[PDB]
Every structure is written in C-alpha cells, then in structure tokens.
Design a protein around this ligand. Structure first.
Ligand SMILES: O=c1cc(O)n([C@@H]2O[C@H](COP(=O)(O)O)[C@@H](O)[C@H]2O)c(=O)[nH]1
Ligand SMILES: O=c1cc(O)n([C@@H]2O[C@H](COP(=O)(O)O)[C@@H](O)[C@H]2O)c(=O)[nH]1
Lengths: 218, 218
C-alpha cells in the first residue's frame, strides 16, 4: 500500500469520485470503495477505477449474510474486479469461510472486520471482538480491519492476529484517529472525508503523508 | 403482503430475474431484492422491478456500517425506489437510528434483522438477539426479520416486539423451515430458491400457498 494510506472514496457521484481520486492519485495506489458510491453509480465504477488509475480496490461491503448468499456476493464482487472484500465476523465462521472459499478459488483477498470505530460498536461488537479475531485466525484469515479510534483494542487485535497478518484501520481524520499512533499497530490507515471533502484533496493527503513520513518504508 | 409470501429474488441474471418474477406475479406483490442481484445488475433493477410489476421492494442490504455511512446507504437505496431496507442490529443503536432517520425523513420503512437462520448465527448473534430486539423496540422499530428455522426464537422474538410489529421470516423452502409453523409467529414468509430454481416457479409458489391456505387473510 503506497504511503500506507488507503483512500475511503465515499463520494456518491461518479464524476466527483473520479475527480477527487484523480487529484490524489499521486499519493495513493489503494482505494476502498463502499456502498455509498457503488449503490449510487453501479459496480462498473470499480473497473473504471482500475482503468483510470491502475490502483488496488478494496470492496468495503461489510459482507454479513448467510453462507450461501455471502458466496454470491463475493463471486459477484470479484467478477467486477475487486482485489479484496471486507467481511463481517459477527455472523460466525461459516459465513466467513464462504467468503474465504470464493476468494481463494479466485486468488483474491478477504479482510475480516473484527471491531468498529463508532460508539454503537460498544453495544455488541466490542464484547465479541476477541473471539471474532481468534475465529479469523483459526480460519486462516490473513487480513484484518480494526478501528483507529481506540488504539488499545488495535493492540489487542495485533496480539491475536500476529505480525504476519495485514491490518488496515479506518477512523483517521474525520473520526479523530491519529495517523501516527494508528500505524504503531496498523499496516495502513484508511482516510475518507478528511481528504475527499476538504478544499484541497492533494494537500490534505500530502499533509497526512508528511505527518507520518518517519513511518513510511518499506 | 399478498398471500403472506415474499419472493427472495436472488437470481444474479437480470433476464432470469425479470422472468421468474414475471411468472409468479399472480401470487406475490412483494419482492425482497438483495446484493446478489443488485451487485450484478445495478440499483436501477429496483425501479425496473417496480415499473414492470408494481410490487413493493424490500432492499435486503443487511446494512451494517457506522452511522455516517449507513445514512448514505439508506439515501442511495431509497432514492432508487426501495420501499424498505433491512438493517443489522449488531452494530448497535446509533447505526440503526441512522437508518431509521433517513427512512422517516423519506417516508420509508426499516426492517431490523435481529437473528439469523444459519448455523454460524449461534456463534455471536444468538447470544445478543434478545437485547438487539429490545434495542429495536426502544428505537421505535416496527418491522423485524427473524429466522423460520428456529421456531422457538421466533416465538421469543414476537414476545419482545409485540403483535403491533410486522415480522417477516426467511429460511423457508431451501433451508428447511415450514411455512405453516413459521406464520404462527411471522406475518409473512420469505422464500427464495425453492421457488426461483424450480422448473415451474408459478407452480411452486402455488404449492406453498395452497398449503398455506388456512392462514391467508386478512
Ligand atoms: O469501523 C469502521 C469500519 C469501516 O469500514 N469504516 C469505514 O471507513 C470509512 C471512514 O471514512 P471517514 O474517514 O470520512 O471517517 C467509511 O467508509 C466507513 O464506512 C469506519 O469508519 N469504521
Ligand atoms: O437469517 C436470514 C436472513 C436473511 O435475510 N436470509 C435471506 O433470505 C433469503 C433466503 O433464500 P432461500 O429461500 O433460497 O434460502 C436469502 O436472500 C438470504 O440471504 C436468510 O436466509 N436468513
């Protein structure tokens, strides 16, 4: 992940999407694309992004259905060109395994979302996060997503998943997470509104990259 | 819901979807449309279904993001003409409230998914299900989704939500739930593959209904 910085492109608008991303392409080669954009402009928006930019794309679909439906979702997502897909753990091991199977059958990647950055996450998710993380480990998951906003559960997550696993962390910028601190445990940070909304996308990104310049490489 | 029967249109081919749904319109006026089809053909498939069949559409997106992102998803979804959207409870009250807001601010409905039909659901969901349903009641949620395959959990769900709430239940047909016993608690059953993968979907819909006959009306 170039500069350890993944853009969360949640603009809901094909033209502003391709424009903010084009304006920051110099700084990032990895884009997270979620339902805000995909439901607004269609799954073809993924390809148009691979063409224009030759970036990597993480489909942030928070897959959370029964195993049979999860398989269909993954299959469809990977057909539209996504390099990876983000899957919920709370639905349990069979739902996560359904995604893993399709991923490998198609040589792509699954990220397991173990925990979330918003206040409601404390209600049910936080209490299960350790067991969801261990479930991921037992399942052979290598990629994880954890919240930058509470650094101390990132650390626990790192404990459980080992330094072998790849960890990416949202909640940076808009939600108040510190990029520097997050990267103590996370391999890459995810940043949305801080970049794509601000007056000067390019400058907001470069300001972020400077702030963590001592954390770049390799 | 006509004949208390909701078609889960999980065909991923547009042509096969528009056609099988066409063949059962006699029997059903409410279609659940989920990500298998939407990710294959686009959000426009919802409006198209609406302007061919004049049916209510439940957008089964198992919304499960932070509040900010949930809002964008609900807006995008309702703008493509969905009458309702299905939202996960596990991410907590703020995420669910986020959807309830767009819905109320757009005269639409939210369904709260409290518990699921697959074996994996026992891992984390089952243990939180009562508390998630109670959270639903407190938020003022009026529509719910619960699994037909675990009849004692349905009964339990009905206790908590009241007879005032609308309850729809999947897992009938393919996953082994019986329509009759389910409707003892649920207002409507959801049926997917046991209809849409049948040689004569029309026929299959009738066998379910004919067999449901004593539970029809009002
Ligand atoms: O726990 C999580 C998991 C996420 O995927 N996200 C996602 O990360 C992005 C954060 O964007 P923003 O930088 O504007 O806060 C959003 O797309 C959101 O859905 C999150 O905020 N918290
Ligand atoms: O607990 C649940 C919740 C669901 O939404 N569903 C959905 O209901 C439908 C059931 O389809 P089928 O009748 O072919 O089993 C699928 O779209 C599935 O994702 C489910 O099976 N169990």
């Amino acid at each position: 992940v170039m500069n350890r910085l993944i853009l969360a492109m949640d603009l809901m608008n094909r033209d502003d999407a391709l424009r903010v991303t084009g304006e920051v392409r110099e700084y990032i080669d990895t884009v997270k694309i979620g339902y805000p954009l995909v439901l607004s402009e269609g799954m073809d928006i993924i390809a148009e992004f691979r063409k224009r930019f030759g970036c990597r794309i993480i489909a942030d679909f928070k897959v959370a259905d029964i195993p049979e439906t999860n398989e269909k979702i993954c299959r469809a997502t990977f057909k539209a060109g996504a390099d990876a897909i983000i899957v919920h753990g709370f639905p349990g091991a069979d739902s996560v395994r359904a995604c893993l199977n399709v991923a490998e059958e198609m040589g792509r990647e699954v990220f397991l979302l173990t925990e979330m950055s918003h206040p409601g996450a404390e209600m049910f998710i936080q209490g299960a996060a350790d067991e969801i993380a261990r479930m991921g480990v037992d399942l052979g998951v290598k990629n994880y997503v954890g919240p930058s906003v509470r650094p101390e559960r990132l650390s626990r997550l790192r404990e459980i998943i080992g330094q072998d696993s790849f960890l990416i962390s949202p909640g940076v910028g808009a939600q108040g997470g510190d990029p520097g601190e997050t990267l103590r445990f996370a391999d890459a940070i995810i940043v949305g509104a801080s970049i794509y909304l601000a007056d000067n996308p390019a400058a907001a990104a470069a300001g972020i990259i400077e702030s963590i310049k001592d954390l770049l490489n390799p």
